Design a protein around this nucleic acid. Structure first.
Lengths: 95, 147, 211, 52, 204
RNA sequence: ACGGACCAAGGAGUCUAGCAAAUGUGCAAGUGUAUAUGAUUCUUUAAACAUUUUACGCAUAAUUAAUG
RNA sequence: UUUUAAUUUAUUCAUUGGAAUUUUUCAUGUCGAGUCGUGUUCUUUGAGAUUGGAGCACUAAUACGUGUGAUACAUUUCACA
RNA sequence: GAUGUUAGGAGGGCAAAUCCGCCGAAUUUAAGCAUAUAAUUAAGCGGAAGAAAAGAAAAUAACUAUGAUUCCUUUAGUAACGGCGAGUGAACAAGGACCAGCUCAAACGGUUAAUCCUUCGUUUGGUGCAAACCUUUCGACGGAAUUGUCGUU
């Protein structure tokens, strides 16, 4: 179960933070490369599709963009991360 | 060992004790546990009742160390400690023994048996049974939880 | 099958005659290993073939109480003893880079063990009567007289062994110091009952601290 | 065909082995047994025979 | 610092630049022979990140390899056996196409060299391309070097055929550890042998 | 009804794993010192001997799919 | 005969480099891509809404990441790597 | 790229008990048989050593935590798989044997590739009867290498 990193363990064997009562003890170059490589390469076609879906700017389109990114990348986590990165880039290009 | 074998005492008896009629053939009923539910079903149901089917839910990877806990009943707590010290603790009423059964190798104290009347005893264990604790503090003792 | 027997279970349905093996050489191999370690201790001549290992607690709740020899002292333990891992590995001290000291008890117990080993060490000069005072925490080199007078003394191999724990499963208290109010079974049951929401509170505490 | 995985050896209980050794010593201590085993001991003074 | 940019560019493969470059070089590889020597690595950063070095005894070969599955080796579809083993079309090879590619050059084309690793280079409808790094264990520039000269002594010949290159490690299940590999670690056949080696003590 | 012209020699319930019952033996809430170590034993000996006051199996507690 | 321990003896004169730890400073750096992963197909596994491998399709993040934590998901803590 | 009977070299074949890749059955068992089993076996193809292979965590755990790999005792005929039938069947912890850790890539070094190899030489001392062998650092020459060797960590 869950422990506590402070407030020493309860000396009993069950429950929250149970157990023995021992004493516990406790950017420039990256986005320069990103900028130049972005200048050279641009966006992959599925990234362009996600960009346009984001730019459409309705809840239906954002849902569709998440679904499309999820299908294109596999996995909800990767799809969601791609969607947030593209939303950030769309905001930035809007400024 | 080979000269004590029963086949030796049937040496000139033709059939070797296996019948002149039924003979000794090779797997006349099938191999291993073949005929259960079909032609060994009487044997299976008469000697191994609940053999077929499944009951319960799966535990995927067990890790027996997690739920390992050996038990001891209260009636052996006094016998855990030596005879002379038992006599000492009995004669002297102001002192009680404090026994950490976890050190002897027991994790849970169970409540079977009878503790000595008016003989206090403090027991340290990881787990306690309800009746074990009831008896321990009925004889004037105490249960201490350790881990 | 017939009669009241256990239902058979033998896993001999493959070609097992090829995989059966018998150890006729168990004690012969015993002798060979003994001879090998004897010869490799005569070869290094006085310095033990054993290397110092730390005392660690066996994992899981099954072997919680027991300690044994780990592999390698931690970086913190070596630094508390005053020597670098590279230096320590030249004087028979194992080092492992993976273990960490989660508790001061383990830290100090292994530091004391390392200090005892260091104080027990007597160092042979690298250059035959050109004794120096060492580096990386290695003790200073002993000189001719103490080396000669210690080379004939029995080396203590007990230091390399897992420590023997005092075994007090028994102790006595005054009857007047017995807590007659404690409810151990109730405490256990309540702790199990409350475990779920306390994990909740801990998760919420972590979320709050993350900001 | 004879196989090498015959049960060549036997594991004997340590207590039973020690019992056997103790009983053999006890038997060696009694004269009639030493005589009956085949030793010609008619002329030695005592059977638990010990020398300097 | 140039290798970082090269790596980041090659990380795209779908940009206009990378798409164009891959198209043209794949077209050239298709016309070139199945196994042929390349003067220098076409991906110097990736080769360097694999074991490649600019020592005299290091050579590089480009290999085509056909895609898809190889079909069961029975004459026509006829397989005399149980229906469990009657499939001929969806049979997947244990080895990956990368390992097959490095075998195609390490077996006999240059059997005097030692295969180190291989990398990507290109794809196609019907071929996959690869460049294989090979080392000449008999060159003194390799032998005298305190590094890299591990490959000079034997127990290292035909790693591509003993499954000892990176592709071999991948298809042998050695790219995972712990409970996900479990039964493969000392080799699958050795682990299987140990798991049923029945041991009898002489005295039982 | 089948086998057997004659004679000699060879010729078939065994070995291992695992379980039980029976009986003998040791010890007994314990029991078996596993792998391994040691040790003036190193023809025999590949056996005998030994084990700095919680290795493991079985047993000492059952029952429930299960939190227990 | 082989080697391999202990015991024999080391002393003078010099500069050349290196190394460990400890004081005072600056920057949090690097960290393996048609790869990982996902889907599907076949096989393999004790691995079961898939254990590993392989083919094909799609195809990443950048350490605050991404991978494991043996039941498929979403939001999220924690541990380990 | 091509070509060279240019100089110097390497591979090929045999042998296999142990070892490493691939490919891959059926008999058999299920009292029939098709999934399953036999079996990730036999046969077939290739590849190494005196051992090989694995190996320094994208590992366990959930503990008071352990700490590369291999092997033995055990876990354990257990968790699990399976016409849930016949059958199949691991892992972690624990006790031992042995014990060992490392380098590329990437980072940093341009008041200067600080690297490497070929050939030709000089002497530095040694054990051989000889044959031969071990040490040796001062070069020069011709190349390779900035499409990246070497040093640092």
């Amino acid at each position: 179960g869950r422990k506590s990193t402070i407030k020493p363990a309860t000396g009993i064997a069950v429950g929250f933070n149970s157990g023995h009562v021992v004493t516990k003890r406790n950017s420039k170059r990256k986005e320069l490369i990103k900028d130049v490589v972005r200048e050279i390469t641009g966006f992959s076609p599925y990234e362009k599709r996600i960009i346009e879906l984001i730019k459409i700017g309705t809840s239906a389109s954002t849902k569709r963009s998440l679904k499309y990114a999820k299908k294109k990348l596999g996995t909800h986590k990767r799809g969601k991360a791609k969607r947030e990165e593209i939303q950030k880039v769309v905001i930035l290009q809007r400024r | 060992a080979t000269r004590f074998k029963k086949n030796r005492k049937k040496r000139g008896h033709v059939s070797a004790g296996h019948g002149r009629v039924g003979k000794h053939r090779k797997h006349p009923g099938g191999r291993g546990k073949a005929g259960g539910l079909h032609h060994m079903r009487i044997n299976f149901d008469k000697y191994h009742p609940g053999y077929f089917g499944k009951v319960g839910m799966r535990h995927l990877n067990l890790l027996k160390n997690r739920t390992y806990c050996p038990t001891i009943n209260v009636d052996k707590l006094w016998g855990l400690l030596p005879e002379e010290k038992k006599k000492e603790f009995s004669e002297n009423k102001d002192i009680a023994p404090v026994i950490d059964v976890t050190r002897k190798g027991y994790f849970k104290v169970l409540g079977n048996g009878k503790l000595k009347h008016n003989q206090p005893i403090v027991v340290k264990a990881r787990y306690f049974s309800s009746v074990a604790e009831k008896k321990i503090k009925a004889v004037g003792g105490q249960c201490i939880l350790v881990a | 099958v017939a009669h009241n027997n256990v239902l058979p279970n033998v896993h001999l349905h493959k070609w097992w005659q090829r995989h059966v093996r018998v150890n006729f050489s168990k004690n012969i191999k015993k002798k060979k290993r003994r001879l090998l370690r004897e010869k490799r201790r005569k070869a290094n001549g006085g310095t033990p073939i054993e290397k110092l290992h730390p005392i660690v607690h066996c994992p899981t709740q099954r072997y919680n109480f027991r300690t044994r020899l780990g592999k390698g002292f931690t970086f913190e333990e070596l630094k508390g003893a005053g020597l670098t891992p590279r230096a320590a590995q030249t004087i028979g001290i194992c080092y492992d880079k993976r273990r960490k000291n989660r508790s001061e008890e383990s830290l100090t117990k292994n530091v004391e063990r390392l200090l005892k080993y260091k104080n027990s060490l007597v160092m042979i000069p690298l250059k035959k009567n050109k004794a120096k005072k060492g580096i990386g925490g290695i003790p200073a080199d002993a000189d001719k007289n103490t080396i000669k007078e210690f080379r004939n003394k029995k080396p203590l191999l007990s230091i390399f062994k897992k420590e023997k724990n005092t075994k007090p499963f028994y102790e006595t208290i005054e009857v007047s110091k017995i807590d007659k109010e404690f409810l151990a079974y109730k405490t256990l049951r309540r702790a199990k009952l409350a475990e779920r929401r306390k994990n909740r509170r801990q998760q919420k505490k972590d979320i709050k601290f993350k900001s | 065909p004879t196989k090498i995985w015959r049960r060549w050896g036997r594991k004997v209980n340590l207590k039973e082995k020690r019992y056997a050794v103790c009983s053999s010593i006890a038997a060696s201590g009694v004269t009639s047994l030493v005589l009956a085993r085949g030793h010609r001991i008619s002329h030695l003074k005592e059977v638990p025979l010990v020398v300097s | 610092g140039a290798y970082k940019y090269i790596q980041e560019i090659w990380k795209k493969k779908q940009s206009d630049a990378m798409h164009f470059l891959l198209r043209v070089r794949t077209w050239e590889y298709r016309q070139l022979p199945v196994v042929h020597r390349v003067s220098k690595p076409s991906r110097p950063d990736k080769a360097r990140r694999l074991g490649y070095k600019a020592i005299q005894g290091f050579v590089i070969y480009r290999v085509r390899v056909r895609r898809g599955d190889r079909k069961k080796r029975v004459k026509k579809g006829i397989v005399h056996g149980k229906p469990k083993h009657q499939g001929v079309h969806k049979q997947k090879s244990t080895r990956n196409l990368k390992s097959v590619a490095e075998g195609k050059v390490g077996k006999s084309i240059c059997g005097n060299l030692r295969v180190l690793n291989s990398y990507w280079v290109g794809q196609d409808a019907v071929y996959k391309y690869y460049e294989v790094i090979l080392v000449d264990p008999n060159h003194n520039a390799v032998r005298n070097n305190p590094k890299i000269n591990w490959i000079c002594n034997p127990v290292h010949k035909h790693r591509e055929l003993r499954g000892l290159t990176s592709a071999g490690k991948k298809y042998r299940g050695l790219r995972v550890k712990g409970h996900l590999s479990a039964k493969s670690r000392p080799s699958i056949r050795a682990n299987w042998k140990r798991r049923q080696l029945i041991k009898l003590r002489k005295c039982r």
